[PDB]
Structure formats: C-alpha cells, structure tokens
Design a protein around this ligand. Sequence first.
Ligand SMILES: [Ca+2]
Lengths: 218, 208
Amino acid sequence: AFVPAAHWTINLKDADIREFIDQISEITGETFVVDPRVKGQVSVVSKAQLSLSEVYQLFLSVMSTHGFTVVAQGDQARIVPNAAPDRLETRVIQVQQSPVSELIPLIRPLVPQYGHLAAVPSANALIISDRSANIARIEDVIRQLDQKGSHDYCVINLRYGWVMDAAEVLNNAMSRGQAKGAAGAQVIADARTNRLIILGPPQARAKLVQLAQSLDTP
Amino acid sequence: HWTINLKDADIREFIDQISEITGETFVVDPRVKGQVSVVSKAQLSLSEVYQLFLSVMSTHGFTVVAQGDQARIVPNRLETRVIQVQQSPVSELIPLIRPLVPQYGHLAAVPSANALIISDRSANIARIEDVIRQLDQKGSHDYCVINLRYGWVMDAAEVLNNAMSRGQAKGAAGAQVIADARTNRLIILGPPQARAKLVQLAQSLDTP
Ligand SMILES: [Ca+2]
C-alpha cells in the first residue's frame, strides 16, 4: 500500500494489478471501471516520496507497462487492453545531481523492448519497468552517470565491426592507460542498432570518437 | 493500394472511409467528434492504411479497442501527412525528427513503406519535410549531442545555420543542425570533418 511520507512511498510486491488500481483510487479519489480482460501480477516500488500527481503518473506507467490504457466510456473512466517475462517490477529511481532528461538516452540501451522508461521531471526521477535484477544493475549505471559533470555524447554507427568487440577494445585501452587524450571519456554499447555512444568532456570525447572510428575501418 | 486527400472532413467520415478500404467494422462512441485532414500522395497497402488510421485516431485523442470482430473507438487545426523517405531507413530518422514535433502533434514510422506519419500545422509540416529531404541519404547518420548550459537552442541553431549559409563557417559546410527545444540541446549531423567542425563552433557559442 501507499505509505504517507502530502507525499507517499510504496513497496508492493507480486500484487494483483486489480489491487493496485483500487489502491490508486483510494489515494487519488479517481474511480475506474476495470475491463474484465485486465489481469496480471505487478510489483511497484518507490523509495522516493511522491506527490499525488506523481502517483498518478506512476499509475499510468504501470498501466502502459502491462499493455493497458485509460479511456472514457459511458460517463466513467475505463481501463482497457491496448493493442515478456512473467515478473515485471516498476521502480521509481530518484536522481540526485543531474536533470533526469539528460540521462534517458544513455540508459535506453539497457532497457529491453518489453520494458518501460519514463521521466518524472517534478521529482527528478525515472520510472523503469523490468525484472528486479535488471533494475538493480540499471540503478548502478544511473548512479555512476549521475556523478559525471557532462552528458554530451556522440554516436557511431559501426558498418564493419561488431559492437561488443569494439566496446571491449576501447574500454581495455582506457583501462590500460593506452588511450591517449581520451582518459575521462566513456563508452556505452547500443547493440540494437550496432552503435556506440561516446560521452565525456569535449576534448576526451573527441579523441575517443577518433579512436572508435579506427576500429571500424574497412 | 490507396492514396488519400481528405480535407476538413468530419472524423466520422474518415472512420467510414477506413472501413470501406479495410473492411473493418467500427462502433463509434457518441462522444467522438472533430475535424480531420489526412493526406498521403504515396500509395499505401491495406495494412499501411490501417497504420495511418491508428495515427489519426491517436492524434485527436482516440483509442481503438478490440470488441471481438468489431472495434470500438473511444476517447482516451492539424493535418496528418504521410512523408516518403527515399534512402534513409525511416526508423533511423524518427529520433532525429521527434525533437521538431510538438507535444500536441504526432509522429510515427511506417517501416514497410519507409514513410513517416506526422500530425502538425501545415506550415510546420512543410518545414520538417525540408529537414527530412536534407537528412535523406543511403549511409547511416553519425551525430553529436550538445546539452547547452548558457545559450538557447533556437537562437544557437539560427546562428550556426546563418554562418554556414553565408560562408562564415569555413570547414563546417555540409553539416546539419537540429534544435531540440524541449531539453535545450543541439543535434549535429553530417560527414566527419564538417560535423566535427560544426561541433567546435556550437561549443564556442555555448561558452560565455
Ligand atoms: Ca460509421
């Protein structure tokens, strides 16, 4: 259930989706007619405190995650099916130092197609839907990116190379101190498009981009 | 295949025209209303016409809900236009064009026809189409993103474009810039040398 923290926190595990909806009505005061086809088990977690409006946003993210949407029929609000692993958790992740919008494109490559990613700018938080072990891993990536001063980035679409090989070569070179002028830059592999995302301060990023290009030469 | 040019028609007519084309039967909720303009000069398959239908419904805040064989249309000036892309994969251009589409608008890909569906004011559509024509190329688009700290992207973009068109940006010629006003960031495109140069100029512009 939602626990007062008017703000609230939540730690609901393996609950019927219908229970979650009813719970949202109790807090919001909104009333929903739930289509008979709406079914499923949900896990919803927020250690960050949420306002009433942010709770509604979380509700929409959970609905969207499981393929449902809210419509108006017959003078009432209706939850209906909209046109993946069994256990999915929807977690709210608060970001401390950086604006959430700047981190979104850097973490999208870690979100699977079945998953969900949304910004909650009023709380400077991200909503992510995934299996719990995947979420913990992403939370660490967020924590690390959040410590960085810059989130500017360059994208390289590899024509010849395999994205994982290239990422491995670039990280090892930096680890060994073998990348000259790129120390401080960082690489993120984005397999779905066979592309690299290079980030860092201007001079280091410009050098790592050049180095990355050399791994993709015909 | 079908083409379309529907101007200022009741949305209920558009729904009827989609039913005749697709054979789908729809039951429209009494609260459904609105005027639509829908254009596709490109020839669309039955399935692609249905994709267009979904884009128009979504554009005006309507959801289509399966009810067995039939489908229920329920609530949750803009023109909806289909734009053909010749060389670039449509799915690649999507993220690059989205910054230009306002939140009241709509943007969707039709990968089987390699076309984009956009809903916006006719004048902003014409502007995007120029941007698409310039982006359109056989090779992939490498790019750089700059989150501005001091400057404003619509101003910065204008300065960078003016310098390139007027000949003040030597070396950056051929590069392209897309302003993303929602997050105050620039997207810099083009061949490697031009792109790298335009990045340096953008960076010089955001240092006070
Ligand atoms: Ca009808």
